[PDB]
Structure to design on (417 residues):
């Protein structure tokens, strides 16, 4: 109650628009074209528009106008599909009076009026904040009208990368729901990737999430070497481990979890040695996620490379010809996380992490089927991923519920919950 979207009140959405208007010159207008229905897939709103309004309907356009240097003169425009009894019955729209009473649009009109509504705002402003390079139908519309125009998405990204305390909590909720789902999967046996896939999906939704945050990875055995494996339909065998990358989303905010565990419910000595190597690197990289350390995301990645090389050296598999650490650990340490899984990709990887940012820490080892490696290591892929909120002098593991220590994993797998 009092919320506009799950976890976020209408007051925070208003304060986000105020913060953006605090960076805009007089006589400016920000134009954001929402997404359309993709024929029909579950609707994904343009996240910059959703971040500033909470509006989750297709075929919509948002305009934030700053006529003077005063923050109280700002006008929040919303052009939406019209409140239509016949259209709503076949296709429930909030209408033009709901978008003002619920979503707090100072001014609104039907999306049909776009060609007669937008130019009057454009003509009375000097700076037009619109990304001429995205696509939506209103985007192709709005762009043709514009044939000073300034980009806006990256400026919004600098705000989105710093999560508010309310954003951190709803992401904590998504991570906790997703994490407890993994624990329930640990306690059960699965003979096929699709059964484990559909199980976690049901636990995400029934646990309280709206949808999957992303297309899940359920890769058993040698399938774990395929970094982008999504088929999730292979038989699972007793001797191998399964790599699962899956998480739920809540109110538009994404969690992101990777766990690897043996299908038999018990680690072999070989599986233990490889798993602890990845867990050692992940634990040490998570400990760096304090803003007082002034590390950038790239700093942590390069430290993850150094840490992984030492783990390979401890395992004696660090000097295989043609298989340096960048071929056994061939991806980045992580990424910002928020309304998008790979959130705010335009912010700098090289600037120090700040309080409120949420990044993943997901190192991995993927040993090829080469005779130059020990046979008990070949075709074994491991990734361990958690969502870390950056704090002043500490951090918050948003997905800490999902166990990952070997003793914790084997306790759940063999004794249940
Ligand atoms: Mn992931
Ligand atoms: Mn990730």
């Amino acid at each position: 109650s009092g919320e506009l979207t799950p976890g976020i009140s209408a007051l925070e959405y208003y304060e986000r628009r105020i913060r953006l208007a605090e960076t805009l010159p007089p006589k400016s207008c920000v134009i954001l074209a929402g997404n359309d229905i993709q024929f029909f897939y579950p609707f994904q709103q343009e996240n910059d528009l959703f971040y500033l309004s909470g509006w989750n309907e297709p075929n919509s356009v948002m305009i934030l106008e700053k006529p003077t240097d005063s923050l109280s003169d700002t006008i929040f425009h919303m052009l939406v599909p019209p409140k239509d009894a016949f259209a709503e019955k076949w296709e429930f729209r909030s209408g033009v009076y709901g978008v003002q009473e619920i979503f707090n649009a100072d001014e609104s009109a039907s999306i049909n009026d776009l060609s007669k509504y937008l130019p009057k705002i454009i003509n009375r402003n000097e700076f037009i904040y619109f990304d001429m390079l995205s696509s939506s139908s209103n985007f192709k519309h709005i762009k043709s009208l514009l044939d000073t125009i300034k980009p806006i998405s990256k400026r919004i990204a600098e705000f989105r990368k710093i999560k508010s305390p309310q954003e951190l909590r709803i992401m904590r909720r998504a991570g906790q729901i997703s994490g407890r789902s993994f624990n329930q999967a640990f306690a059960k046996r699965f003979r096929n990737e699709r059964t484990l896939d559909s199980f976690l999906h049901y636990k995400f939704i029934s646990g309280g999430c709206d949808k999957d945050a992303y297309i899940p990875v359920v890769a058993t055995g040698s399938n774990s070497l395929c970094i982008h494996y999504t088929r999730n339909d292979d038989v699972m065998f007793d001797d191998e481990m399964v790599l699962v990358d899956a998480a739920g989303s809540l109110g538009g905010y994404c969690a992101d979890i990777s766990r690897t565990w043996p299908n038999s419910g018990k680690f072999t000595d070989a599986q233990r040695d490889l798993y602890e190597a990845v867990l050692n690197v992940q634990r040490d990289c998570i400990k760096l996620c304090k803003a007082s350390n002034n590390y950038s995301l790239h700093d942590i990645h390069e430290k993850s490379i150094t840490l992984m090389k030492q783990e390979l050296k401890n395992l004696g598999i660090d000097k295989v010809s043609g298989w340096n650490v960048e071929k056994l650990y061939p991806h980045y340490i992580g990424h910002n996380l928020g309304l998008d899984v790979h959130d705010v990709p335009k912010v700098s990887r090289y600037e120090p992490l700040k309080v409120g940012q949420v990044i993943t820490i997901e190192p991995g080892l993927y040993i090829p089927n080469e005779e130059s490696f020990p046979s008990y290591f070949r075709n074994v892929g491991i990734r361990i991923e958690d969502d870390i909120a950056i704090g002043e002098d500490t951090y918050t593991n948003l997905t800490v519920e999902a166990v990952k220590e070997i003793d914790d994993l084997e306790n759940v797998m063999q004794n249940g919950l």
Remarks:
- Residues 245, 256, 258, 362, 385 surround manganese (II) ion (ligand 1) (CB under 6 Å).
- The chain has two domains: 1-160, 161-417.
- The longest helix spans residues 165-186.
